[PDB]
Amino acid sequence: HHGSGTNVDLGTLEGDGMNIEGEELMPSLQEALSSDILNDMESVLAATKLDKESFLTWL
Numbered sequence: 399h400h401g402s403g404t405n406v407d408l409g410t411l412e413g414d415g416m417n418i419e420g421e422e423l424m425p426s427l428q429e430a431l432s433s434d435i436l437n438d439m440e441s442v443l444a445a446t447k448l449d450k451e452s453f454l455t456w457l
Contacts, residue, residue: 401407410426 406412408426
């Protein structure tokens with residue numbers, strides 16, 4: 399009553415045709431999600447401050 403009947407259990411993509419493609423042969427590996435937890439780059443640039451001769455320490 400369960401598991402049998404259909405064959406679209408583990409299959410998410412309908413149809414096959416890699417007659418041209420042939421790069422990633424990994425089973426179930428795409429992730430069409432658009433996320434990023436690397437916000438150290440925007441900060442890695444320092445927003446131009448190291449090469450800028452500007453002082454802020456006043457005495």
